[PDB]
Amino acid sequence: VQLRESGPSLVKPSQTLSLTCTTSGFSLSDKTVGWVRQAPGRALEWLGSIDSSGTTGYNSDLKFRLQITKYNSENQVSLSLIGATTADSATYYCTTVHQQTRKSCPGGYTFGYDCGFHGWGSDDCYPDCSDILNSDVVGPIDTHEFHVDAWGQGLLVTVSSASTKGPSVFPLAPSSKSTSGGTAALGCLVKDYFPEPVTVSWNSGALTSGVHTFPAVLQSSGLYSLSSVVTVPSSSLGTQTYICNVNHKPSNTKVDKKVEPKSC
Amino acid sequence: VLNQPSSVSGSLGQRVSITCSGSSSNVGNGYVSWYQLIPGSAPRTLIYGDTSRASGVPDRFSGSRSGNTATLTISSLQAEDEADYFCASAEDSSSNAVFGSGTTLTVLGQPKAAPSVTLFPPSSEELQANKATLVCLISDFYPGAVTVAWKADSSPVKAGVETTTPSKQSNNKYAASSYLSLTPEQWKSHRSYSCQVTHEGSTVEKTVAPTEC
Ligand SMILES: [K+]
């Protein structure tokens, strides 16, 4: 399964944060779909889930703000969180989960059903099958079973009153003084965007060895910037074209910047 | 929240244990799971039902539980195991899940390595947009601690500096970046600018100048 989160990257304080989870093909009608989030530097936090039958379960601490809905016909599950605050800024993941309460009997006991008791007492635990009204009957042990089976990639959602801004992309060109013998560094500077995040590839993914995209810095203006760098053979600088592909999904922007070596 | 140590470390080849302490209503209910979060990747399930391994998880990752404390044990530590690890459990209902506070695992013993430093002057395109950023990229160092200082001519510059916290590259060494934002006039008003990187008591400095390119 491959789960996909979609929705706005930016939410104003007190407005409602909404997301949708879709697949790349697999059906979600027979699976339980849940939402997990992680704020920067904080722990994973469970939000809630909805099972195949449409029953929902929420994190107690957030039950009053959350709503999860299923749309079998669109193969979609949605999430809504009312009253957004900066504490709700986070990466939001949709998941498929294993969720069930397993009943078992203590050692040496047997379920009423396995004793022939198919009506009253079929779900109780008996030390033997002598009497449906056995006074030594006991209730089953409940094991609440939870785990995440599949994880989406996550969608970062920022809560802020500042406005979206797409990035300006500038080349970090290699120069005669800046090589390292057989290899040369070249890059792209991705300036002044909001909110996060930006991702960067090189030559549309055909160049992956040597690539590093740095974390963003937050400037005094409230706008982020980052850089991406790749190491390539110095001999290829006059002949091979190098392009950085910058993706800024919060503004629906993609930029392909050709990075030309300097004459210097 | 379940209680984990904020950090653990071990050396290559050795074994480390990450504990997850809860109560009789979550961990003590007996179905704990573990998750691995590598910076850049999506979370990955490692362990479910206390001891069962998810598909693809080598045998050197093992889960266990004793009462209200569960433990993830990683043997034969490899560099690729550095990550954040989280435990989890239902609490009183299968729909009420709780996660642990997270544990950052550091794998020790890789070779020391001095930083490579590349300093880019403002691009011609940025200057024509009436802006100027110097970009200092610091790569392929270990261990992951550096200091970065900027100079205009030979005097310190603090205004307009931003620096990222080092993080691992795909080859398991560290990299970091630093920035000096100037106006085009400030850029042109000095003879040179420098970025100096201190690593393990030694310093690499790169210089650029408005008149050189
Ligand atoms: K119980």
Numbering used by the authors:
A (entry chain H): 2 to 82, 82A, 82B, 82C, 83 to 262
B (entry chain L): 3 to 9, 11 to 27, 27A, 27B, 28 to 95, 95A, 95B, 96 to 106, ...
Article passage:
The cow antibody repertoire contains a unique subset (~10%) of antibodies possessing ultralong CDRH3s, which can reach lengths between 50 to 70 amino acids. The unique CDRH3 structure can be separated into two microdomains where the antigen-binding disulfide-bound “knob” sits on top of a long b-ribbon “stalk” and can bind to both surface and receded epitopes.
The ElsE series of Fabs all have highly similar knob structures as expected from their high sequence similarity. The ability of the knobs to twist and rotate with respect to the body of the Fab likely enhances the ability of bovine Fabs to access recessed epitopes. To assess epitope specificities of the recombinant mAbs, Bess4 and ElseE2 were selected as Bess and ElsE representatives for competition biolayer interferometry (BLI) against a panel of human antibodies that target known bnAb epitopes on the Env trimer of virus 25710. The BLI experiments demonstrated competition of Bess and ElsE representatives with antibodies CAP256-VRC26.09 and PGT145. Bess4 and ElsE2 neutralization titers were knocked out or reduced 30- to almost 400-fold for Bess4 and ElsE2, respectively, when mutations at position N156, N160, and K169 were introduced. Human bnAbs PGT145, PG9, and CAP256-VRC26.09 are similarly affected by mutations at these residues on the V2-apex epitope, suggesting Bess and ElsE bind to the V2- apex of the trimer spike.
